[PDB]
Amino acid sequence: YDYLIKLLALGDSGVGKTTFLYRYTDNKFNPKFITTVGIDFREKRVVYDSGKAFKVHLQLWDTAGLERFRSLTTAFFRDAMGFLLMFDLTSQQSFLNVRNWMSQLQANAYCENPDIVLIGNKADLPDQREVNERQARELAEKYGIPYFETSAATGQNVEKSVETLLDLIMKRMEKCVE
Numbered sequence: 263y264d265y266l267i268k269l270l271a272l273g274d275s276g277v278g279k280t281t282f283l284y285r286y287t288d289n290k291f292n293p294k295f296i297t298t299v300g301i302d303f304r305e306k307r308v309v310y311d312s313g314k315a316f317k318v319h320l321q322l323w324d325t326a327g328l329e330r331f332r333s334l335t336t337a338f339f340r341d342a343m344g345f346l347l348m349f350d351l352t353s354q355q356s357f358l359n360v361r362n363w364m365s366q367l368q369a370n371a372y373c374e375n376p377d378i379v380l381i382g383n384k385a386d387l388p389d390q391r392e393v394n395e396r397q398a399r400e401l402a403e404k405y406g407i408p409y410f411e412t413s414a415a416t417g418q419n420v421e422k423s424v425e426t427l428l429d430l431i432m433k434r435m436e437k438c439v440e
């Protein structure tokens with residue numbers, strides 16, 4: 263093995279990242295780390311009281327697994343170098359959530375800061391565009407990251423969007439040789 267480069271596939275559900283990764287990768291090596299998460303409840307029956315008298319049923323709810331899902335998130339974000347930042351072309355809320363998640367991004371130290379790529383998936387379905395290129399190109403100009411109209415169905419821009427991901431990382435690693 264040459265180098266270990268860790269890439270993350272980000273974006274809101276149904277946008278196609280799992281699909282995007284499946285056909286690109288070409289292999290069946292796929293280690294999973296899965297935890298359990300849940301919510302639950304308990305009931306109590308109390309009388310509540312000139313003072314009217316009411317039979318009251320209290321459902322009191324609780325979350326479980328909570329902390330594991332943070333050790334899970336951390337595990338996912340650790341030593342990350344490249345961000346597959348995709349939205350849906352047929353969904354403007356996928357661009358909205360992206361813009362607001364990029365807006366809340368508290369930028370860290372330069373060489374420690376992961377590279378990012380804005381990706382627009384589902385371009386094989388243009389009859390359903392809620393998305394305008396020049397109204398996405400601004401956001402990727404506001405940040406200085408490339409953009410690809412990709413589709414995990416046709417395979418459009420699939421390789422060159424990931425191969426372009428290395429370039430930025432290797433060119434980041436050039437500055438801090440280590």
Ligand SMILES: Nc1nc2c(ncn2[C@@H]2O[C@H](COP(=O)(O)OP(=O)(O)O)[C@@H](O)[C@H]2O)c(=O)[nH]1
Pocket residue numbers: 273274275276277278279280281282383384385386387412413414415
């Ligand atoms: N036509 C089309 N369908 C897609 C594309 N990407 C994903 N899908 C469909 O979206 C469904 C769910 O996508 P998925 O990969 O699970 O979304 P994820 O949870 O963000 O990873 C799948 O059944 C795919 O058929 C795309 O680029 N084009």
Ligand SMILES: [Ca+2]
Pocket residue numbers: 276279280281
């Ligand atoms: Ca999925």
